[PDB]
Design a protein around this ligand. Structure first.
Ligand SMILES: *[C@@H]1O[C@H](CO)[C@@H](O)[C@H](O)[C@H]1NC(C)=O
Ligand SMILES: *[C@@H]1O[C@H](CO)[C@@H](O)[C@H](O)[C@H]1NC(C)=O
Ligand SMILES: *[C@@H]1O[C@H](CO)[C@@H](O)[C@H](O)[C@H]1NC(C)=O
Ligand SMILES: *[C@@H]1O[C@H](CO)[C@@H](O)[C@H](O)[C@H]1NC(C)=O
Ligand SMILES: *[C@@H]1O[C@H](CO)[C@@H](O)[C@H](O)[C@H]1NC(C)=O
Ligand SMILES: *[C@@H]1O[C@H](CO)[C@@H](O)[C@H](O)[C@H]1NC(C)=O
Ligand SMILES: *[C@@H]1O[C@H](CO)[C@@H](O)[C@H](O)[C@H]1NC(C)=O
Ligand SMILES: *[C@@H]1O[C@H](CO)[C@@H](O)[C@H](O)[C@H]1NC(C)=O
Lengths: 224, 85, 138, 323
């Protein structure tokens, strides 16, 4: 009934993403931190070659240049031990960081499986609101999902009843709730306000109206 | 102000020096050196063009703990450069 | 750990405790060097009545004695914060200090406040009413 | 039936002073420690990252509502007694009755402060974690599924359980004909938790194990200062008291290496432990997102049986769900 103004909201929401992406530069902070961490670790590994670890000098061609093959064994061995344990520290930190990156990659893979190739009913897994569809985009060492969602707005107050009874038989709704306008009782779905006249077809009968708490008398239209 | 001092000369004379006395024919100021921790910056010529004293300010202690002259916004934990036995 | 706590004086035969010269923790809060050169100093797990004794403030430069006692003293469950002007109203968190206190650079000076959890609101509950949306957004 | 499920969120935030641990108040050992350059900054960076990650976990599990709902004055919603999991206005505590039952079931610290080991306090206090969970329980009673899906929409609590019976394939009229029976069973299942939480102490073991592991690691880090690593003695003020500057260089440089590798072993163990705690915190975040704010159709994700609703409660370094 209103396809034209839904398509205008989807064209406007796509356009507002560029106006957010062009101006700022801190929206992709989860991708710059990976680059910073790797570059910092590798630069520290380079800068730890200037330490001497208790030897006479940090330069290996300075121990060999002024000591024979006889006293320079202990200094070279101290330097080798220090540089080996520095390299092992770097590899251990890299292994732990690879583990956390793999955890995030598995999450991205299952999000792509369950939200791009289909529609997911898991709450807040793929955006805020009720999920409709999704679009993947690439990014430097990463992926960016554009989750499109339906969000209700402009709530309205009503007074409601759990059931009604026409001739001593309780009529429960099939889908939706009973609501009360200025003069009459209607039946509505809960995520939109489309008030439909109450009919025998969309309500079902179970029991008498002497045990349900808070039942309100009305009449049920019959297609006859 | 600020002015770095270049080395003119070192003398190989082996004596104790515990007194001195200027020789005049104006004013002069005398200050004593104490063991402290500085952080010095060397440019591409090989000259000291900036220095910070780690025992003066909490900010300077922070600058010596991070080992930089520029500090980003946040809370940092600093070492002990404020007290000497 | 093999660290001597007490020692007996060989002349007067008394007992003396030995403790480290500066034990504890000190933290510095900055708005950035390119923003200002003022700081705020937090001493951790130190009651702020005896911050001068636990830092040996008598043997310090006069630029450290203005971060030891003043009218800008605040006492948080982390410790004592000196240099930050306490404000009663609450905003979002900018610099996380600890135990519910944040600090920021407001109007300029460093202020320390309690962080705000979220927007304060209320919805009424009635047993015969409902709220149903009438419009939507994509 | 109401089933409890306990899961951890964050662990203790720690930080070590490297110079105080390796060479405590010794000027010669400090000058010998600067030769091992860039070895304590690389370690304090890791520990600070761990602490910030712990604060992020605590924020991300609980702060899932942008809008804070006040607890209603009436705690009786259509026969279901909610007074036992919501804060009591007359009582002096700002926590639920069940949360108070959870906070009670979960010369060594002096030697840690002397050697540079400090435990930082958490950013969100116990009165703000327990003020978040009084806005998720109170939003679940007065509103429904939509306070996490958008604007909060008011609904009676009898009509909220009729839609939650439609989610499991049972018609609406099953609720309304015997609403009193279900309301009596829901009051009875809440009361049976307190008779089980008060007596035993083998329900919050997953939260006690975290405390035990962190305290054991820190105490072993302290107790490894008494080793000498092949030197003449483990006391640094005993080598410097009787050895000159020519012989004590090789004896000090055996203590510095051993204490450095002990600190590095502690930091590696803490990094792996922080990884598994973060995995548990991510599971807690998605369970709160999918089972408190809505109704889940995933089998045995949120209890045994067909899920209806859920309530979160705070606990020392963790969260407790009542599915
Ligand atoms: C519904 O009524 C309540 C009080 O009866 C009011 O506070 C609320 O704002 C109303 N809802 C709307 C959407 O106006
Ligand atoms: C719905 O309720 C409003 C109350 O303002 C009333 O004006 C309107 O006529 C009602 N709808 C119908 C179809 O009667
Ligand atoms: C709603 O609550 C009011 C006040 O407790 C009560 O008088 C009324 O009977 C209730 N109505 C229903 C349908 O439960
Ligand atoms: C270093 O010396 C060269 C030649 O004297 C000069 O051109 C250059 O500017 C100097 N570097 C700096 C930083 O001034
Ligand atoms: C040792 O010398 C001190 C200093 O004069 C004196 O007070 C003390 O009486 C002497 N004797 C003993 C047993 O300490
Ligand atoms: C307040 O200072 C005293 C001084 O000894 C100290 O014992 C006490 O623990 C401090 N209070 C707190 C809460 O730390
Ligand atoms: C919903 O909002 C849009 C724009 O805000 C408006 O054009 C439309 O008429 C609204 N729907 C109704 C039913 O009024
Ligand atoms: C709800 O349970 C508490 C538990 O003691 C009880 O005190 C209170 O009266 C109950 N509320 C009722 C029966 O409305």
């Amino acid at each position: 009934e209103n396809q034209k103004q839904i398509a205008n909201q989807f064209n406007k929401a796509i356009s507002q993403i560029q106006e957010s992406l062009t101006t700022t530069s801190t929206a992709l902070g989860k991708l710059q931190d990976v680059v910073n961490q790797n570059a910092q670790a590798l630069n520290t590994l380079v800068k730890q070659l200037s330490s001497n670890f208790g030897a006479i000098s940090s330069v290996l061609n300075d121990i060999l240049s002024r000591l024979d093959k006889c006293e320079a064994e202990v200094q070279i061995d101290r330097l080798i031990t220090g540089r080996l344990q520095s390299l092992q520290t770097y590899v251990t930190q890299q292994l732990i960081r690879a583990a956390e990156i793999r955890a995030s990659a598995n999450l991205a893979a299952t999000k792509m499986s369950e939200c791009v190739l289909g529609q997911s009913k898991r709450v807040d897994f793929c955006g805020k609101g009720y999920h409709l569809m999704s679009f993947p985009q690439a990014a430097p060492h990463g992926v960016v999902f554009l989750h499109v969602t339906y969000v209700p707005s402009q709530e309205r107050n009503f007074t409601t009843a759990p059931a009604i009874c026409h001739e001593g038989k309780a009529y429960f709704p099939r889908e939706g709730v009973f609501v009360f306008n200025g003069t009459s009782w209607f039946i509505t779905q809960r995520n939109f306000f489309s008030p439909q006249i109450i009919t025998t077809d969309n309500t079902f009968v179970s029991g008498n109206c002497d045990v349900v708490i808070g039942i309100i008398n009305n009449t049920v239209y019959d297609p006859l | 102000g600020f002015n770095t001092l270049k080395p003119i000369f070192k003398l190989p004379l082996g004596i104790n020096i515990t007194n001195f006395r200027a020789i005049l024919t104006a004013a002069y100021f005398v200050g004593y050196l104490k063991p402290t921790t500085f952080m010095l910056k060397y440019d591409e010529n090989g000259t000291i063009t900036d220095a910070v004293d780690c025992s003066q300010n909490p900010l300077a202690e922070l600058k010596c703990s991070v080992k930089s002259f520029e500090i980003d916004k946040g809370i940092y934990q600093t070492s002990n450069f404020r007290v000497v036995p | 750990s093999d660290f001597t706590d007490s020692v007996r004086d060989p002349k007067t035969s008394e007992i003396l405790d030995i403790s480290p010269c500066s034990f504890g923790g000190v933290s510095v809060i900055t708005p950035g060097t390119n923003a200002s050169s003022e700081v705020a100093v937090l001493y951790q797990d130190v009651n702020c009545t005896d911050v001068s004794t636990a830092i040996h403030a008598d043997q310090l430069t006069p630029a450290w004695r203005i971060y030891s006692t003043g009218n800008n003293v605040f006492q948080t469950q982390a410790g004592c914060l000196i240099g930050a002007e306490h404000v009663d109203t609450s905003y979002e968190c900018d610099i996380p200090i600890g135990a519910g206190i944040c600090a920021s650079y407001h109007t300029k000076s460093i202020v320390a406040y309690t962080m705000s959890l979220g927007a304060d609101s209320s919805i009424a509950y009635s047993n015969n009413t409902i709220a149903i949306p009438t419009n939507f957004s994509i | 039936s109401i089933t409890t499920e306990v899961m951890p969120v964050s662990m203790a935030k720690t930080s070590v002073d490297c110079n105080m641990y390796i060479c405590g108040d010794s000027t010669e050992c400090a000058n010998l420690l600067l030769q091992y350059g860039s070895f304590c900054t690389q370690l304090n960076r890791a520990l600070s990252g761990i602490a910030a990650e712990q604060d992020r976990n605590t924020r991300e599990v609980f702060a899932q509502v942008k809008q804070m709902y006040k607890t209603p004055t009436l705690k009786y919603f259509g026969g279901f007694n909610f007074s036992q999991i919501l804060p009591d206005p007359l009582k002096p505590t700002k926590r639920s009755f069940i949360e108070d039952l959870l906070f009670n079931k979960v010369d060594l610290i002096c030697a840690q402060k002397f050697n540079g080991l400090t435990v930082l306090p958490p950013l969100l206090t116990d009165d703000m974690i327990a003020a978040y969970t009084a806005a998720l329980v109170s939003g679940t009673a007065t509103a429904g599924w939509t306070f996490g899906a958008g604007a909060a929409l008011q609904i009676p609590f009898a009509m909220q359980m009729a839609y939650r019976f439609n989610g499991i394939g049972v018609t609406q009229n099953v609720l309304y004909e015997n609403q009193k029976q279900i309301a009596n069973q829901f009051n009875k299942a809440i009361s049976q938790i307190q008779e089980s939480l008060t007596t035993t102490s083998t329900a919050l073991g997953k939260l006690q194990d975290v405390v035990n592991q962190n305290a054991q690691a820190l105490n072993t880090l302290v107790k490894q200062l008494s080793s000498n690593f092949g030197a003449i003695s483990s006391v640094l003020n005993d080598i410097l008291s009787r050895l000159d500057k020519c012989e004590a260089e090789v004896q000090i440089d055996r203590l510095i290496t051993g204490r450095l590798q002990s600190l590095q072993t502690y930091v590696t163990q803490q990094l792996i432990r922080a990884a598994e705690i973060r995995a548990s915190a991510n599971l807690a975040a998605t369970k709160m997102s999918e089972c408190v704010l809505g109704q889940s159709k995933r089998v045995d994700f949120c209890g045994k049986g067909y899920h209806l609703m859920s309530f979160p409660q705070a606990a020392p370094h963790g969260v407790v769900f009542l599915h």
